[PDB]
């Protein structure tokens, strides 16, 4: 819940989410 | 000023060829399509980021270990593009927050970082998986 | 990839990234990222609004790899031939930015690397020094940038 | 003259342009 972990893997997500397409 | 003068050629005539679908060079193609991607990577995402910046509660003495700890986490279990265009957004948004919040100093510090990350840890990755060549043919 | 400069590029890549995102925001990178956008907006808003100066130049100046030289010179020296102003230097770039794009079209493609050394030459021969006695570039910004 | 031409419609063009903003 440390807000630069939250951040990461929000970036990690969308990343992955915008790698795909 | 002779250098600067040249630069100020390039960049201006960079910028109308790419307007016209025409590049002047490999690293004005490469900066373009991240340009773009950064971009787009913003545009579908703005509502999931929003605020997640502000939360980090930037000042200079915090910067740099928030910066590690982002960059860290972000490439813990690989690289792909789609993480890189995350990385260099992520350090976009984290330079007008500092500029912002009045901490222009940071600028400078996080645009060093930045490379130096990118140099020692992404370079690696990059030559295994085609270079920024690569990179403009799926972004580009 | 190409190793020989590889670390530069990559920092040439970050300044260049982070130059748009600040710029995007209502910020500035430096002074010199400050001069290269109102320089790329002037251009804009100078072929926007006289758009048919730049009409079909390479067949009303019969522009061949041969002549295209001395077309160039030729123009800019009339463009020049009485004086300076800022408008005239944003003509001067918005005239070598079209000639680029022309001659890409009509597939002569090499004169865009030439005509981008001619007029490196021309400012730094004939235009730096009334940009000296005028202000600077920043001068430029002040009345022409956002 | 094609040189002359065109030149002297970027001069005319530039000296507007001058004028407006600045």
């Not at chain 2, 600067?4 to 373009?32: C, H, I, T």
């Not at chain 2, 998986?129 to 690569?134: L, Q, R, Y």
Request: glycine fraction near 6%.
């Amino acid at each position: 819940m440390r807000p630069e972990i939250r951040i990461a893997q929000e970036l990690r997500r969308x990343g992955d989410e915008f790698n795909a397409t | 000023m002779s250098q600067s003068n040249r630069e100020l050629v390039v960049d201006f005539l960079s910028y109308k060829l790419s307007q016209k679908g025409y590049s002047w060079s490999q690293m004005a193609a490469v900066k373009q399509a991240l340009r773009e991607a950064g971009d787009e990577f913003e545009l579908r995402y703005r509502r999931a980021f929003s605020d997640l910046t502000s939360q980090l509660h930037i000042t200079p003495g915090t910067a740099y270990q928030s910066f590690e700890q982002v960059v860290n986490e972000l490439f813990r279990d690989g690289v792909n593009w789609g993480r890189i265009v995350a990385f260099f957004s992520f350090g976009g948004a984290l330079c007008v927050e500092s500029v912002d919040k009045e901490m222009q100093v940071l600028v400078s510090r996080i645009a060093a970082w930045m490379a130096t990350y990118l140099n020692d840890h992404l370079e690696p990755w990059i030559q295994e998986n085609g270079g920024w060549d690569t990179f403009v043919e799926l972004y580009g």
